[PDB]
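Support case: user asked for a sample of complex input and structure output to validate their parser. Sending the pair below.
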Amino acid sequence: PTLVDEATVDDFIAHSGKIVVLFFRGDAVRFPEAADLAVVLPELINAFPGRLVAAEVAAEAERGLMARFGVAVCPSLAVVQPERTLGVIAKIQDWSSYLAQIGAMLAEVDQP
Amino acid sequence: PTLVDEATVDDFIAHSGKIVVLFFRGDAVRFPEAADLAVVLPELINAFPGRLVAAEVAAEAERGLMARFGVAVCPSLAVVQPERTLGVIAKIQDWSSYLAQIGAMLAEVDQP
């Protein structure tokens, strides 16, 4: 349960090592029930031990992050998987080796 | 593969639903063999229909993107599962509904 903005969210997500739950709250007058989601959010994170981490989106960051992450309305949770380097194939290798390594990484994606 | 830099890479790969292959080439004097990789790269992308998208890292972006993706050697291919939204849960829902929907997204991650 941090608070993130457009300046701090990228690094929050990318180095969490967990699936991120971004909480879009909204104004208290328009969306007072968002507080109910806020109270349950840490219980939700806890219910999947080791898998999730939460952050609330700063009010000024809402428009841009909703657009980026595909959120239509508030309040919402956006569940986001950080980027991950599956592998690095360094130096010049033969065609068969490229195909085997790429294939193996795609297999891990498809059956982890 | 198109040239990307730190400012353009994320927009380039957005909404691909593919695995990204980022080519770090390097200076011709120190890494002449990078050109052999450049020639193989499009063939590699072609060898896995629908699975991959490729981009070449612009020279000025090499240092920053090597740090971002965990690359220590040139020439190389960094094979990256991009950041993506697994789902959005809109408006206030009940506890069992949150647990089922989150559980579903985690199940799809663990066994696509």
